[PDB]
Write a protein that binds this ligand. Structure first.
Ligand SMILES: [Mn+2]
Ligand SMILES: [Mn+2]
Ligand SMILES: [Mn+2]
Ligand SMILES: [Mn+2]
Ligand SMILES: [Mn+2]
Ligand SMILES: [Mn+2]
Lengths: 288, 288, 288
């Protein structure tokens, strides 16, 4: 048309030919445990709905043309049991990783991040960095406890980003810091500027960074459709700006997006999620 | 009462005696075409509801008393066919224009802007400026294509204000710029300050400026009740501040407000729309 | 658990032993009169719901541990007639005041503030300050008219904070100012920074300050669940920051919170209200 969008980049016939591969994880488990509501398993469908509709491939405001990228939608990870779904998720992300392609996993609840991280720890033995963008710091199932408990993974390369002190147990903080992980509280992200704060974060995570974006880290005024709606947090613009940085940052080797919940809110929030991926995609179009 | 509001300025018995004339255009057509939902035809009723209720005529925070202005509500433009409704709309705005009064048109979808602009091109032969405040830049029915295609109208005097690169076809940008029109992306409006950016815009539009305000240019966090809800965009305060500037700016000769959709959201969004008009009215009270 | 919250501070067996005492006032009367909707009487229940669930007692982002404070929930003020409910409310707040404890009153509509203020004027004869955080300045039942009309109370120590010129009768302003009270318009609070502006306000109110927080002074984008939803106003973060200041400010001797309305919105808004109290509580933990 007069206005080619994200849909037009899905010209890769074989997954092996796509620069970026989208994987769905339609399962609830995550913040629904810590008070949140059911429904995150519907996130992948809602994301896909707007995926077919949004995001000009040539953005003249940012002046980035992503027309050259190929996207592929590998579908949903489905399994008879939950732990098996975890296994098939990890195995799938790893394969995409192993061949040099970029995996983006749309969820689904926080718990997908554990499989995703292990896929990383296999793909880059001992040289993985991880950032959790999340208003929550829950590490008592608790995906980042699992990763901190990994032999291969160095905690000096783990950042909790935009976490909120009103929602973070002190034992939880203690654990991360005792593992030499870094807490970057919302107030400080906001103090520095989100993108600048996130630059700092990639300095800490370094090579082979897993960019994990819990969307309940955004304020519910912009992002109400999540299992654990946030009173304060990142604005939609900050989110976009951060996704663009991640995309242009060549050490960022995969991304997941957690907690999208269309039962909580079904129109505005899925648009934000697609626009976040969109900005990532634009950023990606700029790397060598 | 102890608190005279906008309703009290409707003391003009004859339209001819009102400084400002309100015209309703209860028709859907506009962004409902480009994905949006039906319902904008209900905007004029919802606007009128809050019109009867809001806006202290003497504002001691801005220290502007609008007590001296007279408003008149000329009602809705109604017609058996749509193109006829367009004709009666243009003809009506022109008459108000022709006699020196100020027309404010409440919609209704974007498409009203075409009739409105032609009313301007008749009233000020060859000396019209136009600003489209809109997160969208759609010019492939497409009201501003129609105006750019006008012999009389000079594109050097056309500004797209607060448009969003994630929602603007590059062919669409190309067309405007190839007509010597100006793109003022959201990011740059926000960079400069909305009012300062809008001052710049009136410098470009100049004499006999048509102030066209698509309300889906505001973020849906403030302005959810529109046909095409915006993830990012102008805040309500920015909108008010911009309407006040327009009002005090003597080259601004008419105004329309598009895309208000009470089926999408019916309480918060109509209040914003009335408050936007309210600020315009205050600004107007300050011109010579 | 790994994450002790506000609930854990309710270890005071006898009210007399609690540093802070929560009193519910489940009555509508207030802004429902001036256009608002019914439902504020449900605020205390909704507040209590989230009270059982939110607010880490040790906040490592602010680095304040409130673990040492004791809270007590004295329940709801209930009465056969409304004026009697007013009497029992005042009498109760006074008793808590008289013994040195800190009363926090959750409403309920604006009208609770009159009883609350009289409780103050009894407890500190002639030496009371009052701040009304409110997008409204309504003083024509009208709780602050009642207090300004008090012999004992000095108007030089009354501040209207974050009031909005689009919603304030000029006779209303005139009355306050003619009583030597101070208007601190939203625009100026925002100009200075909310906390800095509020510091200024406590300078004016001084000793024995009643911190009265109408929650419809926040923008409805953050705080939609109120009887009179605000188009513009304080952000949730500003609210929290202001509540923290109030808490650490030793001249602040009681607090009330008005206009919470779960019939308007029932999940996001009650969370904000509890988080506001939470921040107050943290601030309180810091005073000598
Ligand atoms: Mn999480
Ligand atoms: Mn979270
Ligand atoms: Mn438009
Ligand atoms: Mn638009
Ligand atoms: Mn009030
Ligand atoms: Mn109020």
């Amino acid at each position: 048309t007069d206005d080619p969008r994200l849909l037009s980049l899905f010209s890769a016939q074989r997954e092996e030919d796509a620069d970026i591969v989208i994987i769905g994880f339609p399962y609830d488990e995550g913040c629904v445990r810590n008070g949140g509501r059911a429904g995150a398993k519907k996130g992948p469908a809602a994301f896909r709905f707007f995926l077919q509709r949004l995001g000009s491939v040539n953005n003249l405001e940012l002046n980035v043309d992503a027309s050259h990228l190929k996207l592929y939608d590998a579908g949903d990870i489905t399994a008879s049991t939950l732990e098996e779904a975890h296994e098939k998720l990890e195995s799938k992300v790893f394969t995409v990783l192993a061949r040099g392609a970029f995996p983006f996993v749309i969820g689904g609840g926080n718990d997908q991040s554990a499989p995703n991280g292990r896929a990383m720890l296999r793909a880059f033995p001992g040289d993985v960095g991880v950032i959790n963008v999340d208003s929550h710091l829950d590490v008592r199932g608790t995906p980042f406890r699992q990763l901190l408990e990994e032999s291969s993974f160095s905690g000096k390369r783990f950042v909790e980003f935009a976490c909120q002190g009103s929602q973070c147990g002190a034992l939880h903080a203690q654990y991360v810091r005792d593992h030499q992980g870094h807490l970057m509280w919302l107030s400080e992200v906001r103090k520095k500027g989100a993108v600048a704060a996130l630059e700092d974060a990639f300095g800490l995570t370094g090579k082979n960074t897993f960019f994990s974006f819990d969307v309940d880290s955004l304020k519910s005024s912009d992002m109400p459709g999540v299992s654990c709606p946030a009173a304060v947090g990142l604005s939609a613009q900050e989110a976009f700006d951060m996704c663009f940085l991640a995309g242009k940052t060549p050490t960022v080797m995969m991304m997941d997006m957690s907690e999208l919940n269309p039962l909580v809110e079904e129109y505005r929030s899925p648009r934000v999620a697609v626009y976040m991926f969109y900005h990532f995609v634009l950023g990606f179009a700029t790397r060598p």
